[PDB]
Amino acid sequence: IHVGFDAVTGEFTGMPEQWARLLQTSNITKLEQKKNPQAVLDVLKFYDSNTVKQKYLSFTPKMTDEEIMEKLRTIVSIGDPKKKYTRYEKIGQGASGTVFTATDVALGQEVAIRQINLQKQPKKELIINEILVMKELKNPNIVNFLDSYLVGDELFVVMEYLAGGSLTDVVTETCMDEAQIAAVCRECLQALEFLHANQVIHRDIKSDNVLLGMEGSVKLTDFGFCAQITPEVGTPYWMAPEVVTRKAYGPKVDIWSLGIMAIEMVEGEPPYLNENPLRALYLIATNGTPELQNPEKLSPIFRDFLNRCLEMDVEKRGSAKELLQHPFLKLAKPLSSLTPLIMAAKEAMKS
Amino acid sequence: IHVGFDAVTGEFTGMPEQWARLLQTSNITKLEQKKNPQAVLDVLKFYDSNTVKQKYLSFTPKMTDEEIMEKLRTIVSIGDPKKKYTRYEKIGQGASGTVFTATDVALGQEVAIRQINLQKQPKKELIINEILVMKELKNPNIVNFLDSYLVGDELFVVMEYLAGGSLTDVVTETCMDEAQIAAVCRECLQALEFLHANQVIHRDIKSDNVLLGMEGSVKLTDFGFCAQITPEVGTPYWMAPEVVTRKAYGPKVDIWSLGIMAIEMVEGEPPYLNENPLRALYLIATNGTPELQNPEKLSPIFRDFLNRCLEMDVEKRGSAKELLQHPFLKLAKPLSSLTPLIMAAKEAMKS
Numbered sequence: 001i002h003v004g005f006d007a008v009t010g011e012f013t014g015m016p017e018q019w020a021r022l023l024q025t026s027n028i029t030k031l032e033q034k035k036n037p038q039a040v041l042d043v044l045k046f047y048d049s050n051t052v053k054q055k056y057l058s059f060t061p062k063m064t065d066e067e068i069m070e071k072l073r074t075i076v077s078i079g080d081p082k083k084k085y086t087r088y089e090k091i092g093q094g095a096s097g098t099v100f101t102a103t104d105v106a107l108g109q110e111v112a113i114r115q116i117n118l119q120k121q122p123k124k125e126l127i128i129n130e131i132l133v134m135k136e137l138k139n140p141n142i143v144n145f146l147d148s149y150l151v152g153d154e155l156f157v158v159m160e161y162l163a164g165g166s167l168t169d170v171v172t173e174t175c176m177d178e179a180q181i182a183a184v185c186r187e188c189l190q191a192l193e194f195l196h197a198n199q200v201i202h203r204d205i206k207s208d209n210v211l212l213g214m215e216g217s218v219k220l221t222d223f224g225f226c227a228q229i230t231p232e233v234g235t236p237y238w239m240a241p242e243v244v245t246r247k248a249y250g251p252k253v254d255i256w257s258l259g260i261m262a263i264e265m266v267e268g269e270p271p272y273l274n275e276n277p278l279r280a281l282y283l284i285a286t287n288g289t290p291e292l293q294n295p296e297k298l299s300p301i302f303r304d305f306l307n308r309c310l311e312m313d314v315e316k317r318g319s320a321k322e323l324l325q326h327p328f329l330k331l332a333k334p335l336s337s338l339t340p341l342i343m344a345a346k347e348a349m350k351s
Numbered sequence: 352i353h354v355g356f357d358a359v360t361g362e363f364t365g366m367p368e369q370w371a372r373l374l375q376t377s378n379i380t381k382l383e384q385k386k387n388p389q390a391v392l393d394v395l396k397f398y399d400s401n402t403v404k405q406k407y408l409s410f411t412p413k414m415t416d417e418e419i420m421e422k423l424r425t426i427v428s429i430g431d432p433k434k435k436y437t438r439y440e441k442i443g444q445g446a447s448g449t450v451f452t453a454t455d456v457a458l459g460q461e462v463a464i465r466q467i468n469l470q471k472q473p474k475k476e477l478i479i480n481e482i483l484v485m486k487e488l489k490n491p492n493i494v495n496f497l498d499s500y501l502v503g504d505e506l507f508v509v510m511e512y513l514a515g516g517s518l519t520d521v522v523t524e525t526c527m528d529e530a531q532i533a534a535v536c537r538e539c540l541q542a543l544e545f546l547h548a549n550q551v552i553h554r555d556i557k558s559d560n561v562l563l564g565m566e567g568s569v570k571l572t573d574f575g576f577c578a579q580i581t582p583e584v585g586t587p588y589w590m591a592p593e594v595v596t597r598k599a600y601g602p603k604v605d606i607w608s609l610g611i612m613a614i615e616m617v618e619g620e621p622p623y624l625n626e627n628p629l630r631a632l633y634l635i636a637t638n639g640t641p642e643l644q645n646p647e648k649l650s651p652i653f654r655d656f657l658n659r660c661l662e663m664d665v666e667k668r669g670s671a672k673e674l675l676q677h678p679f680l681k682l683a684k685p686l687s688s689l690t691p692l693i694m695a696a697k698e699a700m701k702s
Binding site for chain 1 (some may be wrong): 416417419420421423424425427428429430431432433434469470500504505508585630
């Protein structure tokens with residue numbers, strides 16, 4: 001319902017008590033409110049309603065046990081997941097199932113295992129169709145579906161994984177040069193080109209969801225339900241302005257998030273770290289890019305790259321297929337150059 | 352290859368060294384040998400070759416995981432067998448899988464669970480077809496298929512069971528009257544009529560494979576692969592003469608075995624208990640019926656029943672559909688009359 005704004009007093013008129021509550025807790029000043037009331041009102045609407053939600057790739061080119069067994073025909077192997085994999089470690093649990101990392105005993109290569117109870121979720125058909133899609137959606141810069149197993153009522157879905165940890169672990173414990181950063185950016189853009197070409201928007205490009213191999217190979221995770229194989233309230237620093245303004249959005253939100261990720265790689269921490277989430281959302285909507293700590297060090301060509309990623313105008317902002325041609329990615333080192341940083345990160349992590 | 356017999360010396364000529372070995376260990380006398388050499392030679396052939404074997408009901412009106420999942424479509428439930436059943440007790444294990452008894456937590460009724468590894472058996476198709484058949488083969492005097500569950504590579508098959516133990520436990524610890532014996536015989540004949548009507552020969556009718564309910568209900572087990580839910584070299588006391596003479600045989604072998612079972616019920620132990628297995632087989636082939644310990648006590652009409660069951664001539668011997676009309680079964684008590692004997696048996700068993 002319509003709400004107003006009395007410009008000299010700086011008070012919104014007729015807004016819900018939820019939005020008024022949030023506004024009091026927001027640390028947005030009455031200067032910042034009268035500067036742009038519409039931006040404030042948009043980010044109140046967003047935070048009041050962003051329960052995060054789930055994502056399922058229903059892009060496939062009440063349920064009974066025969067229907068389930070029929071849908072599972074093409075995707076279930078006969079095998080014991082407690083015998084095919086060792087070094088199980090539980091990496092998380094929630095309504096969405098339980099997640100483990102483990103290693104294949106025959107190949108010696110690491111995997112992630114999501115364990116879904118098919119009786120306790122009503123959206124059974126969505127989960128299975130998600131798996132059917134993911135079996136056919138194959139690319140080297142995403143974690144791919146490997147295998148699945150039925151264990152009574154539990155379905156085990158096995159995804160690729162990598163031993164070298166997350167890009168956050170590298171970025172927090174080491175300093176990357178621009179030739180390393182361009183190599184990461186190239187592999188993430190190769191992933192985004194493929195996902196966008198299959199009507200997938202990732203929505204959550206950040207260093208936490210970028211996985212590194214010990215040889216320096218790079219994969220994205222958290223693009224689907226099955227690919228959520230990461231431990232994950234807080235501040236949504238990776239989000240683009242059209243998202244937090246509650247406006248319509250499309251695949252170039254992932255290009256913004258990649259830009260913020262490139263900032264995080266050169267600054268070692270994400271933006272808005274100690275900020276109130278509501279004020280961080282306000283700043284994203286009004287200012288766009290956060291402000292750099294030491295911007296004078298960065299090459300012209302990296303700054304051009306960041307500008308094409310973090311342009312607030314969606315039409316001006318690069319697409320994945322375009323930014324793959326951007327001259328910054330010419331500077332990229334071999335991916336093996338990440339190896340010493342991955343090892344440095346691991347030896348710092350311990351814990 | 353042909354072997355002979357020199358009638359005055361009492362020596363077989365030209366027989367294999369296996370059969371000669373067995374003959375030395377057989378405790379069959381040279382009198383008994385020259386009395387009927389052919390019977391001896393038949394039972395040597397039988398014992399040398401009876402590795403028991405398995406039985407599969409392939410009466411349905413190299414394998415890949417999609418083929419397996421397709422065959423399992425109609426028979427696998429989605430559920431956890433380690434959650435649907437409690438009071439698991441392991442009752443046996445062999446090449447054929449592992450067997451448990453357990454009770455359904457919701458119904459409060461006892462069940463048997465066979466647990467089959469589908470990777471470690473090559474005859475996968477036979478096992479699944481056995482289950483598909485058994486799902487449609489339903490009768491109250493056999494243990495029926497209830498449910499099945501897939502647990503990785505292990506298939507769990509759930510069969511009915513009964514709390515009152517085996518007829519052997521009743522027959523060894525109590526004395527049955529003829530009206531109790533006729534009630535058991537009636538229910539076993541009801542089972543054999545149905546099995547014979549579906550081209551099934553049981554082959555192993557004995558008190559060990561007769562299951563009792565606490566209310567006195569009666570079911571057969573060990574007619575198929577899935578129905579082998581009983582702990583089970585030794586002497587084959589239940590076998591008919593045409594079987595042990597290695598001759599062709601048909602469903603009236605079950606009627607012989609039922610006759611021997613009726614003897615076991617009134618005598619409290621099976622025949623040939625302390626006998627050499629080779630001599631027991633010789634006696635079955637030549638004498639037919641074993642000799643009763645106290646035959647003067649038994650009614651005329653029970654003796655007529657036993658005669659129709661234990662006639663050595665297959666043509667004279669009763670069929671199930673015929674013996675169901677035999678006047679002995681008119682004497683049958685209500686099945687509840689078994690209840691005190693079942694409880695007496697259990698309270699003796701303890702252990």
